[PDB]
Design a protein around this ligand. Structure first.
Ligand SMILES: O=c1ccn([C@@H]2O[C@H](COP(=O)(O)OP(=O)(O)O)[C@@H](O)[C@H]2O)c(=O)[nH]1
Ligand SMILES: O=c1ccn([C@@H]2O[C@H](COP(=O)(O)OP(=O)(O)O)[C@@H](O)[C@H]2O)c(=O)[nH]1
Lengths: 414, 416
């Protein structure tokens, strides 16, 4: 029964943190769990309590005004919106620009480590395609662990439907060329399961997730927001609506610097009859004249500690914020762009009546003020958020899915 | 069913690390887990992935220990009726309460009670000398249980104490633990109960065969190594070529054995003359006071014992649970030169009697004993065989995962 389990993620702390509860659930059941990424992530892994395995070298994706253009927009992965050439082009661009940059810097070293350590199971972040390659080379079972509304597997479904419509001579697959190429050098074939896993462990509540033909194991999202301590000032319950605003390095590197500044956001919120807590990086802190009387500025505060009894979370649609607000039943305001699943994170809540999404480009002082007022005053938002909270709470925990993962590993692995 | 669970530990990283797998098992089942200690431990807690709650102020225990560890009154290694008059066992409780338990706990107990009042945990899980924990629990009606890294000399010495107490006339009955903890509880309007001394139940990481039998509700749990923040270095891939021998000296080793006995530099030189591969984990001051490094020896600041000990032949250490337990789950024979401090001697003796390892008093350690002991643990296969039986015993114990529902049921039974 006792397994070696290799977690693999691209070098994003935000992605890593989504994997920590499941990793610990498996370790707590007696399995050995190692987490592999590029050296830049080693320090972050080590502060999760989990054993880090540095692999390969660091990449230049972070250096490479905003990241929204039609070819990077996977927010509406629908047949009706994709000709063959459109979906093919999306796979070509995503493979060349994102997936290869994230993964090629470490894939061979990951295959090597897998050969040495011989994991029974590899659990991979959904864009960490180095993971299933390494698994397949050593015959390990492997599964995606999702932080995402599954635009990746859904766009792939669209892609395969269009591929099947093409004459044989015009059939082309950038994912098969890339991953099949690497697998070929180790004497292995490509299979579609290297793209979507042998199964999918999904932290997204079923009602908000795109329906797909996958072996799907739902698991409850449990907040992990990185290294955290409870400050003294949390004891003071607020006395009026508490509104939390997070801008990270994700926010800035992707939204750019072209839209409404955080300084204007603070000033708007500073005029309102609310308590404001703003988690800001040191550059956006300095670039800021006066701090309003109703506002506290922090470098970091643990969202899981802060969001109980909060009224609103304002953020860009990353899963840590989205999920932590969701489990606390806090309405969310998501001014964002069509990058990764961020727009879907916003629209899913918008359609459910649990929060508000707006395009970052349309954000003004008036929209900010009115949106916050609406999420505080209109009780239908809290009620819809509370239904989603309850849906998450009905989902089996990491603990509960451990035996399922054990059985699936026995079935699919060597 | 969803619980708030407060872990409480004295500010020792070695103690904290023993609690991490159970804490994560409970978090993985959907419960909220916070870990409280003095501010000095905050950084250590944060690197476990668990949420830290700094409480109270730091204490001076380490300064008072170094400025003054093994004497008859601090020796709880043989907690037996036959070796304790009333006056002997009373004196042991008086000194341990005044010197160790109060120093560790009084600096944070009131702030811990305050936090418990605010947060309202359903359950408090406490390190076995962190008596602030059960006080805070009792004040808010939380269920509470000890989580043991120790051969349970604490509860066994208490049993001896209570047997002798019962033999005294009622006017001569005196209990330093009841005075101390009952005093604090009294200020919050609560009574003392014996369950604040041994918990409502005991979650025990020591294999049953090596643990002292007691009148406790006992929940055995498998020890899973956690050795602090860790990564796998490249040089581990190289399987060894000859017996690998690992030596740890920590700041526990130094502060408690500190400077009467065979120096670490002499230990390195002895091992340096043998046909072995040596890895020595040493603090930065031990490293400086060292002329040459032998050819067969690698010196590290830190290396994860869970990664290092598979295939290793011997671990040499002072009897701390992290080392003991991690060697045990890897079936690695142990050589334990140590003193009668905490349960360290029992950690050594337990393995010695089982034929799985060797213990010697630190004061008797020479180059010849070191060399001969290592040779014996490498060459005589009966050591590996006995170690392997203990490994198998641990492996038959239910995991943290498996005991989660037991802890849930016990909390429902005993709590609010
Ligand atoms: O003050 C803060 C800032 C961030 N976070 C969490 O830390 C992680 C980082 O997420 P994000 O997507 O913002 O990316 P980052 O730029 O922090 O890498 C997520 O769990 C956030 O919700 C938090 O708990 N408190
Ligand atoms: O190189 C090292 C040094 C220590 N440890 C572990 O770190 C923890 C703390 O060490 P110890 O019990 O020696 O006491 P300390 O010296 O840290 O007080 C235990 O799990 C040890 O077994 C380890 O894995 N590798």
């Amino acid at each position: 029964s006792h397994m070696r389990i290799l977690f693999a993620t691209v070098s994003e702390k935000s992605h890593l943190f989504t994997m920590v509860p499941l990793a610990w659930s498996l370790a707590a059941a007696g399995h050995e769990v190692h987490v592999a990424s590029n050296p830049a992530l080693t320090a972050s892994i080590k502060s999760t309590g989990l054993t880090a395995v540095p692999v390969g070298k660091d990449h230049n994706l972070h250096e490479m005004d905003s990241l929204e253009n039609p070819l990077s927009d996977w927010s509406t992965p629908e047949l009706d919106r994709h000709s063959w050439e459109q979906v093919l082009m999306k796979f070509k661009v995503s493979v060349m620009f994102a997936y290869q940059t994230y993964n090629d810097c470490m894939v061979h070293e990951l295959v090597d480590y897998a050969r040495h350590w011989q994991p029974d199971l590899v659990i991979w972040d959904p864009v960490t395609y180095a993971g299933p390659v390494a698994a397949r080379v050593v015959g390990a079972a492997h599964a995606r662990l999702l932080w995402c509304i599954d635009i990746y597997a859904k766009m792939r479904e669209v892609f395969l439907a269009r591929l099947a419509e093409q004459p044989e001579e015009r059939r082309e697959d950038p994912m098969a060329d890339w991953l099949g190429g690497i697998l070929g050098r180790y004497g292995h074939t490509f299979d579609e399961e290297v793209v979507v896993g042998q199964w999918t462990i999904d932290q997204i509540p079923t009602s908000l997730q795109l329906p797909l033909s996958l072996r799907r194991v739902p698991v409850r999202y449990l907040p992990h927001n990185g290294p955290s301590e409870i400050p003294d000032w949390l004891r003071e319950a607020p006395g009026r609506p508490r509104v939390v605003l997070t801008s990270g390095v994700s926010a800035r590197a992707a939204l750019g610097g072209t839209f409404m500044p955080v300084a204007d956001m603070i000033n708007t919120l500073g005029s309102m009859d609310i308590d404001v807590v703003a988690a800001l990086p040191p550059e956006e802190v300095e670039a800021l004249e006066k701090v309003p009387a109703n506002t506290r500025i922090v470098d970091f505060v643990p969202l899981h500690a802060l969001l109980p009894g909060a009224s609103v979370l304002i953020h860009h649609g990353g899963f840590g914020s989205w999920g932590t607000a969701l489990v606390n039943g806090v309405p969310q305001f998501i001014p964002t762009i069509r990058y990764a699943d961020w727009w879907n994170k916003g629209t899913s809540l918008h359609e459910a009546g649990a929060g508000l999404v707006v395009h970052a480009s349309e954000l003004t002082a008036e929209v900010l003020r009115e949106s916050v007022e609406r999420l505080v005053e209109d009780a239908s938002y809290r009620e819809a958020a509370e239904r989603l909270r309850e849906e998450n709470q009905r989902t089996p925990t990491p603990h509960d899915v451990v035996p399922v993962i054990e059985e699936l590993t026995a079935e699919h692995g060597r």
